[PDB]
């Protein structure tokens, strides 16, 4: 096959990785804390099955993933290491990161402190802007494919509903964190990279408040919602206004009125001055409360310390 010589190293993945751990799951298979045999380092590894009835168009999503991590070199997006193949499986190998922004609100239930909110809406951000320097979008931001890795930088993960280009005009993405010009396309119409600065302005929220606006509602009426309503905000008053400022301008309904990733680069909000180790000190904060969670051996935040296993 063409994409298997193309795309995949040919070792078995079985001889290069040990000590394999469920760290999450995705619509493949588990994803799973690893050690590469090679250099006894940690690293993450998404298996994904094309076996069953559904092969064909499973294969096609495995390779068009591949595809598109190997293009990526950038610091604010999940490194990409490899893969391989073995019985109906593909093993995609990337960096390890110890959770999502997500796992991080789980633990802690509670949102982020603003300078915390901040310093991974930057890391998010500049990867955005990266990829759509490229002509990408990623189309599924939100903060369960933000990731962090140590010492502490934060990584864009998932790009299982990314485009190649833009414009594009795929009903694709995760209802709650949809811009509302993708959801018109569930008709029709295109749409371009600043889809995602909308999906950051509602993952700014969903970091401010634990949960995306209008999660309260089932997921085909809060799409009608967005696409009809005007754009929701930031609850509180106590944010400062900077904050405030950057989820207003990335919630534009209008597209043309909403900035490019490339010019919030510039914005206030992101650029304020922060402690060099905030992320160095959340994750830190966060392995603390971890070993607290009553039930550390039955826990699926316990990962965060898998490495120290
Ligand atoms: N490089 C990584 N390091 C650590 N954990 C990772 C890594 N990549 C993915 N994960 C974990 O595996 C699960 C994620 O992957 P992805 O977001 O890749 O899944 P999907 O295939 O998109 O599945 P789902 O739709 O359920 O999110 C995530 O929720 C995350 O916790
Ligand atoms: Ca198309
Ligand atoms: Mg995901
Ligand atoms: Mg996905």
């Not at 391989?84 to 789980?106: I, N, Q």
């Not at 310093?119 to 990623?138: K, P």
């Amino acid at each position: 096959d063409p994409d298997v010589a193309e795309l995949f190293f040919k070792d078995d993945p079985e001889k290069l990785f040990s000590d394999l751990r469920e760290i999450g799951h995705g619509s493949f298979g588990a994803v799973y804390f690893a050690r590469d045999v090679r250099n006894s380092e940690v690293v993450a590894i998404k298996k994904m099955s094309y076996s069953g009835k559904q092969s064909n168009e499973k294969w096609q999503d495995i390779i068009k993933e591949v595809r598109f991590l190997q293009k990526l070199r950038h610091p604010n997006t999940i490194q990409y290491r490899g893969c391989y193949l073995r019985e109906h499986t593909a093993w995609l190998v990337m960096e390890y990161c110890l959770g999502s922004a997500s796992d991080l609100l789980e633990v802690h239930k509670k949102p982020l402190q603003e300078v915390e909110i901040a310093a991974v809406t930057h890391g998010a951000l500049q990867g955005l802007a990266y990829l759509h320097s490229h002509n990408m979008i990623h189309r599924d931001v939100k903060a369960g494919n933000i990731l962090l890795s140590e010492p502490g930088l934060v990584k864009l993960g998932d790009f299982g509903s990314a485009s190649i280009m833009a414009p594009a005009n795929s009903f694709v993405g995760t209802p709650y964190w949809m811009a509302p010009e993708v959801i018109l396309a569930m008709d029709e119409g295109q749409y371009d990279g600043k889809v995602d600065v909308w999906s950051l302005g509602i993952t700014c929220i969903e970091l401010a408040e634990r949960k995306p606006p209008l999660f309260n509602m089932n997921a085909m009426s809060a799409l009608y919602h967005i696409a009809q309503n005007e754009s929701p905000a930031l609850q509180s008053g106590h944010w400062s206004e900077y904050f405030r400022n950057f989820v207003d301008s990335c919630l534009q309904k209008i597209p043309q009125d909403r900035p490019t990733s490339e010019v919030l680069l510039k914005h206030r909000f992101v650029l304020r001055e922060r402690p060099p180790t905030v992320i160095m000190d959340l994750i830190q904060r966060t392995k603390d409360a971890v070993r607290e969670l009553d039930n550390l051996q039955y826990r699926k935040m316990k990962k965060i310390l898998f490495q120290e296993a």
